[PDB]
């Protein structure tokens, strides 16, 4: 692993005392910023007392201006399922990211088929769709165990402040859609353009409220780098899910589901893929013996949004699971596509580090559980949506039995291996201990 | 621990080989049935290798016709909160039984106060009552951690058979109430007598369907004595909760809540207390040097129903939590009363054994969680219960927002210590290990 860099020199000598702990390193000088690499077994045996080059620079990070750290990576380049050297090389938490990502593809897999069978020849698609959700959570957890075998008051005042400015942004979005209706007001295509500039403004407000949430999480003085990012993700899916889901919410009570699917595909392709590849050309044209050349390539890395958008994709998977079926299929196309571009995007990365000790997606996981939770009553609530009073009455009745039958089916699924190998493995642990 | 008793003699010698394992015992002969006591430190040190007289006869049971096993018990007799020698003497699982029983009293404690404040001067009692339920589960679990610190197809064919005969008994109860209406048919007091004979018939059908469920669980060939009793309890609360809750269900859709409270108090006093003390007089009049006299007293022990009725008491706590408030207060009187009679009932027991290794009530615990779960929508569903169509419409609307606000408050409570002592305790474990 390497490093970049008066008080920098003196505290650099203070850092060299930490190099004098048990470390072995070297320096490299070019382009008016310092750089220092390192590599060191007996000291790694002391590291083995504290708790395989991935583990090596990993433990170097456990030891610790800027800083950093390929024929097997080229073996990935030909090779890109990928979980073996993906875990061995890319990392564990991101290995879960591509892993449960590919699981999200696997949930996407048989689901679109029955949706095509639906669109051939009506709410049973939504019912068994919710079943597909619960099963997706189910084998998500089961497979999570499988790869687990394969491996003070002013803060709450600011919480109320984020509540108030949050709903202020929400009604601001309501001004986006209502003023969008005024914008297309004075055939369908004027509203299509208003949806185009509207989702463009959503592309604006995503970075706007998003980096605003970076100020919300950055101004919270987070000591730990596990819970601060967690609640930062909580606000992220909060305002972001408000941002995305807000327009379809304006569609529902305040048809245009084709525009919703256009925003789905363009949000997949034109926004995420094309803008994401645009960022590679942004840094690229902004710029535009073996280990020496790779160290030169070092001059040439968040995950949560790349997690969260899949959440948004799951939010794509959930909400309009009410209306139109076929968005799941092309959604799965964007899934496998963004899987491949995710892989090559990881190839394009700025030297992403290791990340150890994680069971699952956690905040994202139970966040998805709650996504199903709000999703059921939500999509039902749109699904039902003189004597017309009694019509809406019967509508509310189907809402009710829809709710009770819905969660009843949810618990019915919730009724649902290698612990035998855990037991005999522990018997072997005492046996080798003997 | 002791024992009672041709092939009995030969297999008795086979048992004496198990006495020749590491055991020390003695025999005693009277009244045409055999009896053998036992007591044995080095062999108990071998028992300490396998995993304090309670632990002694406990491990004797771990070693194993009929069989069995008091100035500290008299110290309980004056002493009867009781958790110290209750755990030390009475046992751990039953110590949880009296423990979370007294916790159920503690939930009963401040709850009746606001109910009196209600009955002075309307659904907010039910709302905060559900809050009292969720908190009851909450500090039930938290206190459970606190005392935790202080310590193939034909079977499913029979499951369908129990379903069919179960609903057959349910409609049979519907014949009980409807034929009870025919019975009082040809002022209110004729219906009071019909309720009297009705609940008497419920007292019949409790033992009837109850021992029928003993045939359901006894004919299931249960190998283990942990899951068979669990599902036996599941059928027990199933048919029993159907039995009790069936009449008020007949009251609701098919006022008489005073008769419901009369069945509550009489079910507490006349049924449970008076019939229970009647069983002591049943065996008593059916019958009607220190260790010698106590061994003579040995000639002179289920728990689940004694658990389950509290469930029924919780089922008393839940359902008519819709209608009338003051049944909680006298219910708490029956709670403290049945706590005392529970204590002296444990004094009256037929030499109850030890029971180790249990975190909590389990089947009963999440059974109570589901009791709240069905309870919320249930009591709401009774609580809302030309243009009268639109009246029931608005009724259904309050049902809906009642449901969403209800579970919303439930999760709001579900947002909610000595693990520090666990950590420093483990630091002391390595330290004493050092």
Author numbering:
A (entry chain A), B (entry chain B): 123 to 127, 167 to 201, 204 to 214, 242 to 254, 278 to 282, 295 to 305, 315 to 355, 409 to 438, ...
The authors write:
TMEM16A is a member of the large TMEM16 family of membrane proteins, also known as anoctamins.
For that purpose, we generated a stable HEK293 cell-line, which constitutively expresses the (ac) isoform of mTMEM16A, and purified the protein at a saturating calcium concentration in the detergent digitonin. We could further constrain the position of the conserved calcium-binding site, as density between α-helices 6, 7 and 8 coincides with the position of the two bound calcium ions of nhTMEM16. As a consequence of conformational rearrangements, α4 and α6, which line the opposite borders of the membrane-accessible subunit cavity of nhTMEM16, have come into contact at the extracellular part of the membrane to form a protein-enclosed conduit that is shielded from lipids.
